[model samples]
Target chain A: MYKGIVCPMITPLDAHGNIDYNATNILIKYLEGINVDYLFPMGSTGVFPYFTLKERKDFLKFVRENSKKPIMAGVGSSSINEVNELMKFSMDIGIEAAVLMPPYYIKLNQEAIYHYYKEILSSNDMDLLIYNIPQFTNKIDPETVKNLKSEFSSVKGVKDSSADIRGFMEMLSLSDDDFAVFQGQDDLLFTSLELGASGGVCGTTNFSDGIVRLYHEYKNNREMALKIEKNDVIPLMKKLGKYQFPNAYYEYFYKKNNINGGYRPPMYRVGIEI
Target chain B: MYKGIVCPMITPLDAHGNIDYNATNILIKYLEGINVDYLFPMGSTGVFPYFTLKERKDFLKFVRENSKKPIMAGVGSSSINEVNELMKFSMDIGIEAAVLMPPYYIKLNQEAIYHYYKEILSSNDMDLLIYNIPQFTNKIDPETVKNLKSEFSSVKGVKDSSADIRGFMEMLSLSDDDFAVFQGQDDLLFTSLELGASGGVCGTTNFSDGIVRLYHEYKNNREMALKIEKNDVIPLMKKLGKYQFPNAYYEYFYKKNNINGGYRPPMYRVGIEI
Candidate 1:
């Protein structure tokens, strides 16, 4: 539903390992100041499956209360029941759209995946964004996406995070002008935007608000977008690779800005010299 | 705790999509009749993550009550708490070992993965098998396996299903003679057994008992094992690949043999004209 830099918010947990709503509010305020288009909570960045159902719903509620922008909550899970449960909760709590990454863990065939979305979409009236992060979930093929788009009205768009640019190209070719195709790969934000992607659902946006500037530049001034991509975004992402857990750097950035943000276990905040 | 052809039992579902315990019992009896060394319930083939916690525990209980063979339950999940919960339930209910695939979903680094095992092993007293199925879970590096083995006595063995033969070779080199190394790749069964691996946790074994014969022939008669691998198993696997989902063929075989067996949704039975 958004058409610019969408930040998949990094969840801030307190020392007691609970969702730090105060810190989260500060993050939302920071993002609001920088002018991000949309807020996505409980995506891979938010550790959706790791959180309890209560925690996820509470996080959604907190985001809804604090942020003025439309929120897209990740409701994907290996279990259909869990997806339905989370989707129901997110919808009830006032999310604009539900981002689904398909059923992971026990990888399903393309037909099964289509059927899964079909079954879920048949019941839920909320706008659905099919997430194509093949690194985490099964690859949602372009043909399947085409089929899904034609079959379901709720299938409004897709967020493709895969490194495969050909698949992205296929998605562009398959989708009509009305469909919203958001780039999820941070490095490809400029390229994907140039290739007619509506916006980005970027992890790096958590650390740097330069993505918002880059997004605006791409739409208004091509040369400026190129300079940002080559000089700032690309170089910065390369540096982010030096960290053992680059995503944890979200907490580092938040802390540096004097915002109280931290990570959960298995994803501890690192002390990167750079 | 077990060595030889261990069947990663596929859960049998009836037409109504209920877990057909009768079909499951028949499949167990069929495997028993074939003289399989161990019965591994709730593994990848069994669709552990796809099932509800109660269903997994119920399936384990059914197997425990019906079958006499040593059971190794697949207790891996994205959450350490869920893994420990299932592991605890599985162990308490008399499973010989718990197979732990490193956290999937979020894709943790090697150090985080090592810490994951360390945290799980510290509190749990039961025997653990570090499952290196990078296709599903995070790659459990050989060095990490060595460290885990050295650190925790409960970390008994490893099951390397990654296509990287070097990883499997490294696992063989890292673990002690007493540590059980199981091959998860079906075709590598003979080669793995030859390389001092204890046995295999094979998916094809759900339909075919030739794996059991292949196991015996490898141990006692090398020539026969080579013949079985070349003539029967390898050829059959090659043919199975023509189907959209080869794992679905398990149901086809089970159906042909008249042993009651079907599959959960996302994995349905295929038609193969013999």
Candidate 2:
């Protein structure tokens, strides 16, 4: 549904454990000002499952009202009923597309995983992106993605968050150019884009405005994109992600810039303030 | 708190997807008849995350009423609020203890994982078991388990489904005998018991009578336990788990013996009917 950097926005919460809409407003505007192609909310970066259904609805509504960019909401869940419910609500509130990881918690085989995407897509006409993050969802293999896309027109794109460049290459080899394969790992964005990845769904773009600009610059000026990524984004994100959860550390940048950014419980900024 | 072969029961659903209480009653009695030590409902075998809160509540209540064995209910959720709510309901309905995997979906670090358990244990007096199955919830490291056990007296045991025998050894080395370490993987039951593991919360024990017998015989006759595991249990379970999801394939055994065992949607038994 989108090209270039799709920033999976960090879900900012207040000390009281409620979604801080005012802080979110500031962050959304900042992302738009820096010129990201799309805004993705409720991803792992957004802590979608941690937020209540009501909180997600409210947050998406806030995003819809404030941002001009297309919103690709992460609507993955352990149950199809829950996923469909979230997708229906997201579509109702102006989300252009939905990103789905496999039905996690219960490990599924490739067949069941394929059927899972099929069943969900059959339920709604919503544009869907497969999120292959093997660290969380069991690996959605290339054959499964190829099969899913062959059957369903709504299976428009894939966000390969597994960070396996070979897996990305396999995906590219199996599928045609019409199917969008977005790189989800920040460090691999430049390399993946060089290898026919349409764009990235990056968590680091929440802080690094230069990475956002690099996304726009890559197609025209390859050397500049690689240099900015190698010199700026990779070094800083590698340090930021070295000892802490990436999303938790990304909140450090927001907090530094005085955006009302803090984490939900069981995730927090520790030791690093700025 | 008690142990031997705690069969994490397969939740037998009718063709209509409702809780098959009749099938459950029969299965619970069958486990008792075979001298299984404990009954764990709503585990991965039970498809805990797939079932709704009401279905889980109903299933646990049915288990409580039908079985006299100590019921260790699986009561973890992606949200702490939902987990606490389930824990409260499980406690209200007379469950003996709660088994918690670290909150899935949002990958928390070691410190955050510690607090995830700490927060839940503090919410109620329910004896809690740490479930370390990295395939789902990011692996709960041995030090984190040790930390939780040291701080919370109610943090009673661990179900190490990660199947890393070395990890189990670390858990045994770090904690006291009063804190139980139950094996969640079926293949490692005999080896885990040999290493001071109190017992197992096994899924394959649902239909394998040899495994049930082995759990008891291991205490008195070690050679007999090894013989049954080597000759009977391992071979059959290896064949069963070879191609299909173990839990879904496990339902095949129940269906073969004429129990009302079927899978909920998005999880199915295909080409593996016994």
Candidate 3:
């Protein structure tokens, strides 16, 4: 559903734990100015699950009302019942699409996980993106995606968070251009696109448009893309990510650039320290 | 307050997903007959999260209606508001204690986990039990428990699932006898008591009474206790637990004994596997 450079947007929160809409709006508008293609509101970077369901709903509503960009809402929950509820709300708001994590906690068998997606998709006509954050929901394997394509047509793409380079290669080799896999890890922005992913829904994108823009340039600008891809972008994100939590590194970079976004409460701001 | 082998009983379910009250009654009666000390309903084993608030309330009511044995109710949820609401209901039903897990999704700091328990305990006159099933509620460390105890006297004890023998030994040494350290893991039953843990709230106590009877015997008969503790009880439970899902072992044994204790759906019968 998204391509090029997509950033997982942050939720602007005040000291009282209320949404800072004015600041959040400014952040998105700032990100829009950065030449990124798409955005996902309220991902882990956005502290999506930490926000109350109502807060999430209102935040999405505010974003949709305000932003003209293609914003995919991150909308999966623990059960089919919840996924149905959230997706219905997302559909009602007319979002470009919804990104989903597989059912957590229950630890369903492969067939069951596929059946869950099939059931969710069959329930609605909305084009769904699979969120492959194995660190949270156990990794959605490439075969699962290939099988999802063979079986369920609503599964349009994936948000790839499998940090393994081999896993990324297999995903790319398995399906040429038939499926879209968006890189979820920020540091792998340039590397992912080179491996056949259309783009990424990076948590760090909100913080650093400089690297993101360079990565995007490498994704699209052919002669420059090849040279930049070969020369700089890959090694840069790798080195920077080695020192900081990739999302925090990006967040830090963004704050320095006059991006008014702040970390959600209970989530401390990461820095040069481990 | 239950100072012996307390079984966190499974909520019996009929085919239609309603609580099987008749079967639940049979299971409770059977557990009581097997010399199990306390009965805990709607715990993780009971799959209380899958049930509605009203369903949980009614399930507790069923437990109250059927047995005079002391009961503890599981009341942890993502929302403090929900936990607060259920605390009142649980107390009203004459449940002696309630077990609390940390706010699950957003991993909290040690202080935050401490305050979650502190806030709940302060609100009610009812006693509290800390459930330390890290496998379910990503580990709460012993320092947090010590902090809670230092701050709140009402912070009674923990149902240990950490399964680390040295940690349990240190914890038992640090805490007072009034703090009821209940072993939730069957493998640690004898060791926990040996380490000075007061008792246990085990899921496996549902089936095998052979070990429980032996533990009680060990508590009463000194010479026999030495032989049982060293030679029989621990090894016996380890062997029996291997025979089935320790929680279901007693229930399945009850089924064969013509007690007809039905299992909830999704609880696979360990028919030939064990």
Candidate 4:
């Protein structure tokens, strides 16, 4: 079961349209030094859809080699064939798991979504993690997650980012204890764990390992974790958007904090320019 | 100039995944019957990105053979190479005018966006139609569009879905009148024409000739056009969405009104059991 903070590592690109393996290697080494539990590459944040299938395969392989940790390659797409191809490619590259969101272009009901997951699980003999972030990929309700769990063992955990822990609690109530709930909504990390999530996957954890490590450290000293999670990070993020002209929004914060962390090619620094 | 109500023709896909030629023939015949000024196959509405490059070429070629109308293929992507390939393929198949949106996966600034268009225009000999739908692809401002017009003669018209006819009119006031403007937003058809736009390119136009034709008729006759455009279609659309169950959106109304419309594979429809 995949849990705890995982950096959705951005693919390093050179001036030409090739992967910057040296930079990627350096970034992964940095993350490992900081003690991240898992490293995810090729997500929405990773700009997976933008890359060719060949680029995707190469990057995931590179991530596996560099991180040498639990690696979940984001392999989400609208087309079933593409998703199947991605799953096969990720598995072949020796990545441990594939995380996928429901097709975003078309709205599908819970049953249709469950059927999609079922098809993915049956078609590919790989560990599949449900990527649940309604804000980005439309809504996938608690019922769909439970239905996927009931039908397939491949739904290792939901990377819960719906911003509603009550929903996560409901999912936990429905599923077995071993079925992990990884808090993807970093702002709600401690709150999600307070309910029943095993661990979390904070993208910000790439830059600041202190967030998750402190939370884990605080489990021994509950007062300290609560003080840091509630009093520090939450309020800082709240005001972060207002301060930076182009914004210390998640993307900006990541780049500003980490040395190798820069905006991906098409997602460039703007206004004042980073 | 590539302006005036260019209908992005819906490619009819039979359940077997074959393009329904008879249906295509009828649909094209009907568009001609309604007198749609321009024709595009494999626009986003037509699900072009979902198809392979070979299929896109074949589809464009088929449409060109079937219709005497001017055909412009939608050729926008993350890869400049892919865009170039599509343009080359289209030109080889006798498609001269092309619609290109900015690279959508990653956002860009005005300079970066200008560079994007310049790159496409430089790469291809085909006449280019600027596609401005900021919601789908974070896009360039009007000043940049004007700059593009000033720099390149082939930067013909824009399919502007910004829903700001005032802005389009302002753009017209600032730029040359020969540079065409086509409204992509269905709700703002007549307003655009009144503001000196050449015409529109819309998804819903395929559903019914009523909206498209009425906009044309209303051009000289304000009273009748306003009565149909403002009062009739909008109200009918609202009624269509209400209490018709899950598939009651105008998209469904298109089918309910005896139009041969079913969603593509990834898209959804409410099943009878649901």
Candidate 5:
């Protein structure tokens, strides 16, 4: 269901670290106007783990209500039950498709990770996207990804953020007209599209929609996309990711929007200052 | 003040994946009768991330009410607020000491890890132990451990489970008689004890108290502690760790006692079968 530059929306928080509803409204309106293909609420840019169940539920509802694009809710947590709790909320609120990183924190082998995804797939009726951001959680193997796709018809696609080019290619090989695969990195958008990614869950698009523009350029303008990508998207990703993840993204995005972005604690101190 | 074979208690679950209170009662008495120095409820072995807030709170209370040993409750969660919530509960229930791993899943730098502990220490009145299990969560550096120890008087010590001998030694060097530095790995018990670990948070002690016996023997008969460690403890550690962790430990421990041991969710499938 995911395609083009899917904006992994930055969750704007107020001084108390609660979701800044007004700021979220502004951010949502901005992404919609830019015509980003999909609105990914509560992805890494949202700092998925730090959010409370109620906050996540409210945010997903808020985004779904506000946005024009298709919404792929990120329902990541440390366990299957927590994922189910949030996912059920997502499904209830009309969120049909959802993305999930493997159970974070505790280390898991391929079998364990497979079981985690398997259990969630068994329970939830929604279209499931396997999110392999090993940088954040368990790295789903190419073989395992293929197996999940083979076993569960609802296991639709993957958003690979591991940045291992070889690993990405192996997964890309598994992707077809039926099973979608996308790059989770903003910098790799142009290359990944050329290589066979259905789209990219590009965080840079949250602030600068050049990535969305670039995706269109890739299809129609061809060489022009690489130029915009070379000059803008790649540079922004390299610079923004230099700081602790999502901190620099929050800083850059909020600064550009002229909005005051307060982050959840541990995040508030850094993004506000650094 | 944490010292000596703090049995990292595995949260024994029933068939339904809820906390097995009866099994917890049995496990507590077993650890108590063996006379281990402290009981660590909800450490990594307990699968801290997988548990619900109620499960953790009840487990801590169960261990506290059931055992004579001082309980070091693990108050680990993804955010400061969750940690604070659990820590406050710990304080309310008379849990004086708490251990925490840096927020897991998200890769954090030393500064972020330091800030995480700093925030927890600032809010809570309990003694905090820095849990550095890089395999599971963000690994805390020795310098960061030293800094945390230097800054917060209530920041008692650390449990280094990275299994890096050089890193362990560096942390051990910072550990004084006042500041307790512990080996969180079972196999490293003898070597770490010889190199001045306050004690080890040995998981094998949960199943086999030979590690505790190793600690006592080390103090009394230095020669025989090595013998016990060499012949019994080390081999057990090697064999037991081969499967997906806590699985093999759960397998051996529960079978020997002939208890109906069921793990919560993912764990339930493995230990019960493998």
Candidate 6:
């Protein structure tokens, strides 16, 4: 049932891979001041799987206490058991919704994909958002999404980063008036809204408020939204998607705030020196 | 250092997705009787990523007390944080070695893969068996493996399932007299041994005793070993690999013991009814 410019927040970590509380506070306040609708901590871009359980819980607590907006906690990981555990923790802290993606690292059929969500919804009472980034994992088809929505009252909405127009439209076509369908690609925010997407879970929203501003611009000032999409968001996304994933986003976001943008081990920042 | 047919044991779960302790006990004793050198409890085939932490601990404790063979615990998953945690627990419960694979779900470079092992090796003092399964994760290069073994005394051995003959030979050539290099492909067991592989960590070893028998036969009777490899192991593996990953193996292994071969969620048995 949630909608609008969902900022996929970056987990601000030091060179030692520990969270920088000052940077986190800065990012949280930064997003809120810019008029974003919801905060998504631990999205695919948030390095959710890399963070320890304690790190995640600590961040959730910090964000929950300090932030003014609603949260869509990213609970999906390589382990479904761990995913459920994180969801349970998030719910315990009074978090309302979770953005659960398909489990990665193994190939899954549509049948298995359905069960993955079913297993979570069966036990947890929280509102669930289906995040389908098929490049990362198996695709959760339009049929599957429709079926889940029909089957579970907790099936809330979807955010897709597939970047395929036909595929995005397929899911969009299936969405009822009550069902929220958000675009996930950075460049397509305004266009997705034009094509009837409820909102966007934009990665660039971590740094640029203009991307968030586009959500309202599309509704109230269509020409201004088109201008920002064509000139600002599109150009930035070209650079953002050029480099190895998330590093470019990290570089852009931290450098924008003058925070030391060092990364954790096994995820080094390369070729973003400029 | 550990060597020989390391049986990648299946984690036996009922249809309800709880561990069938009765099935586990039977499998443990079954491997012991068949002459497998090491009992691998949570390797890829074991569905290590799907299992909960307590389930793993319970399994380790069960196998530790009951099994006759040495255990090489499979601690690798998408999270290196969890991998290290599993390794620490495994060491605590008297597990001698871990068959650790590269962290999956993300495309990793050779550098990232090296740091992954280094990160774990720096913390844990237990013996490490580098498990290189390229289809699942990124491949661990010959140079990296050699460097890890040379740098960390705990880098005991490697089990490769790349199924590349030239690639396997490259690693085999790098091994010192004390270093162990095991073949992970079933058909290559005898051939790999002939070409200087220390042993095999075979998936087929989970079900078939003839696979284990190939290990000793190669050393004692070369002709018999070739016969087993060409006549038996090769034929069975054709059937095994022809189907979707692991379902065939699960079917073959459990059905051999008259166990009801049901799988856990997100992974069901298919196409191996015959």
Predicted candidate 5 versus true structure: per-residue lDDT over A141-230, tens digit per residue: 999999989988888888898888889999899887778898988788788888988988888777787788888888788789899889
The CAPRI category of model 4 is incorrect
> Model 2, residue A188: what's the lDDT?
84
Judged by DockQ cut-offs, is candidate 5 incorrect, acceptable, medium or high?
medium
- Output the chain A TM-score of model 6: 0.96
Candidate 4 ranges beyond 4 A from true positions: A65-68, A105-122, A162-175, A223-265, A270-274, B16-26, B48-58, B61-68, B78-84, B102-125, B134-140, B147-153, B162-175, B205-207, B215-263, B270-274
Clashes by residue pair, model 6: none
Better of 1 and 3 by TM-score: 1
TM-score of chain A of 3: 0.83
How well does candidate 3 reproduce the true complex, by DockQ? 0.20
Candidate ranking (TM-score, best to worst): 5, 6, 2, 1, 4, 3
Cα lDDT tens digits, model 3, B26-101, are 7887788887877888777676654555667788888877888887878766545557667788788787878877
Could you give candidate 1's per-residue lDDT for residues B1-274 as a string of tens digits? 5467788888777764558888787788888888888888877777777666667779888998998888888887776667778888888888888888887877678887876788778879898888888877678778889889999988878888785777788888865655888898777888887788888887777778778889887766998997888788887777776665534555565665675555444555566654
**Each prediction's TM-score versus the true structure:** 0.89, 0.90, 0.78, 0.79, 0.95, 0.91
State how far residue A86 of model 5 sits from its true place (Å). 1.1
lDDT of 1 by residue, A1-274 (tens): 4477788887877764457888787778878888888899989877876665567777888898887798888886776667788789878877898899877876568987887777778878888888998887788898899898888888888899887888898887855655789888788988897788888888777768778888888768898988888888887777776775444456566565665555545666666544
**Candidates 1 and 6: which is better by DockQ?**
6
**3 or 5, greater by DockQ:** 5
Overall lDDT per candidate, in order of appearance: 0.78, 0.78, 0.66, 0.66, 0.81, 0.81
Give a tens-digit lDDT track for model 4, residues A1-274. Answer: 4566777776665545456787677668767878887788877666676566667777877787766698888987655666878789888878888889876533456655665677678878778878787654546787878877877877777777677767778766654554777777667777776776767766555446656665676568777777777776676546443432111333444454453334333444443224
Kindly list the per-residue Cα lDDT of model 2 for residues B1-274, writing each as its tens digit: 4557788888887765557888787788778877778788988788787776666778888899887888889897777767888789888988888888887865678887776677677768888888888876778889888878888888888888887778889877854656888887777888988888888777776766887878878888999999988998787777777665655454665665686566555677654545
Residues B154-205 of candidate 4 have per-residue lDDT tens digits of 8777777667666667655533456677777666676766777677786555
Which candidate gets the maximum DockQ versus the true structure?
5
Interface C-alpha RMSD per candidate, 1 decimal: 2.3, 1.9, 5.2, 5.1, 1.8, 2.2
TM-score of 2: 0.90
Which digits, one per residue and each the tens of the lDDT, describe model 2 over residues A119-153? 78888888888889887767899999988888888
User: How many clashing pairs per prediction, in order?
Assistant: 0, 0, 2, 1, 0, 0
